[PDB]
Design a protein around this ligand. Structure first.
Ligand code: NA
Ligand code: NA
Lengths: 272, 272
DNA sequence: ACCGGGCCCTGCC
DNA sequence: GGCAGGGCCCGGT
């Protein structure tokens, strides 16, 4: 894909995603927000919060940020890769229709990449160096080893993509998933010849047939969509109203007369 | 364990932990803080930030909150359960000293609980409804199945503890780990006779031999520890200085004269 | 309400 | 610097 193809189509995807994240606020969707009732007194003082409204504000901001990271990884995987780069996403419909992708060892594979020279690459994509931990890495090894040994014909190789950061900053989990296990034993199997990891600039390059500048074209598409969306003023009030909607869930039952929180009442509500 | 034992010993653990989270700030420990360089323009406008320093303040606040959740989970598991409730932590030394615990299927078991009536229960502990996703649930299933099949004599049963929330609020992942798989096939094995999940008030009560008020004693220890640490004033400056520290890692490469940032320089730095 | 995924660190070696 | 773990949602349906 060339510079115009990438910028314009990323813009389109990102434009959509901005609306989706706005709708979180306009529709007052707070049902997915967890609160750890043991940590509340700690957070209140560590971050120098002055009242219950300020507590709800800090919690909401954290929830929104978590949501942004999650939605963004979904955006890259489910919209940008297929629509901008022509990757075939292994969604429900694709998997049911294309043998042998229905088997659960493909739950860990995001896309099939069909190269112009006839090569087929399978892709398992992650955002960054922290995205996986040990449990996930071992499970990735199990899945990949099954593909390799039981469905050798489906593709020429498996790539794990990491869309930001670099190779040197990756954790040992990216070794574990290849079967490289230098510390305590976890019973992963060496598959390093068939599974390769590409990160950051090098991932975007690998995706787009060696075009080194691809990552800048992606960032530019996002920039343009943000600018056209023009949300920097209107969101202040939408965020404040999200905050008021959440506090109303608690502020006529956890508060004392002096405005302090009854942390044991918040505990009660959450833990049963 | 009785009311005063739990309150006071939780207080000692939490006081230790407070000092750990303080030393994050005083030692300017920021090398674990990732930044997604594609999201920066979105965050900047969505949350109505005015310059690079406000972007760094926002990201640090999020990283601190992530670090709090992470730390607190490790606190419950590694310090509180063993020091307060007498649970045996499967750390490296314990696992080496007690067959068959060195085997990797026990990688997912946090503790052995020895009941005074002779019962022996294994515990895999999690914070909340969101802690695990599909990949982790399926791996947990595999580890627990192997324990049940290959090591039936090591315990009476396995418990998954969820330390906040309630059973109604749990996701389907807590069913999947038991081998209950009603949707797309993931090849998990039904082990629900030997694996049970307890959440919130019920987890704490299960842990402490049926004492229903245990969750409240845990919270009271934490509150005392926070009250006693007196951190609300001094942290304001500590967090400001953490921000100054982080911003200097990028300022020379990314800053415009007006204190805004060059997103493409930020991307270049991060992605190779 | 389901559900198949998506995502970011600490504390001690 | 390694490493065995620790943590929290979206979007389609
Ligand atoms: Na993925
Ligand atoms: Na655990």
């Amino acid at each position: 894909m060339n510079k115009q193809e990438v910028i314009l189509k990323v813009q389109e995807c990102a434009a959509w995603w901005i609306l989706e994240r706005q709708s979180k606020l306009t529709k007052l969707m707070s049902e997915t927000m967890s609160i750890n009732p043991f940590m509340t007194p700690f957070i209140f003082d560590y971050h120098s919060l002055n009242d219950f409204d300020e507590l709800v504000e800090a919690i909401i901001a954290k929830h929104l940020m978590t949501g942004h990271d999650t939605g963004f990884g979904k955006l890259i995987d489910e919209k940008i890769l297929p629509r901008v780069f022509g990757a075939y996403k292994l969604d429900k419909s694709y998997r049911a229709a294309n043998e042998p992708f229905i088997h659960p060892c493909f739950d860990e594979i995001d896309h099939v990449i069909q190269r112009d020279d006839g090569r087929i690459e399978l892709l398992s994509l992650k955002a960054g160096k922290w995205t996986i931990q040990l449990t996930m890495a071992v499970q990735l090894n199990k899945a990949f080893h099954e593909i390799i040994n039981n469905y050798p014909g489906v593709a020429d190789n498996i790539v794990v993509g990491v869309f930001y950061g670099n190779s040197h900053g990756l954790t040992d989990k990216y070794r574990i998933l290849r079967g490289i296990n230098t510390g305590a034993n976890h019973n992963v199997i060496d598959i390093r010849d068939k599974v390769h990891v590409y990160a950051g600039k090098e991932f975007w390059s690998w995706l787009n047939n060696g075009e080194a500048e691809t990552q800048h074209w992606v960032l530019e598409g996002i920039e343009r969509a943000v600018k056209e969306a023009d949300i920097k003023e209107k969101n202040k009030d939408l965020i404040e109203k999200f905050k008021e909607h959440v506090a109303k869930k608690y502020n006529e039952q956890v508060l004392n007369a002096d405005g302090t929180a009854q942390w044991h009442k918040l505990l009660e509500m959450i833990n049963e």
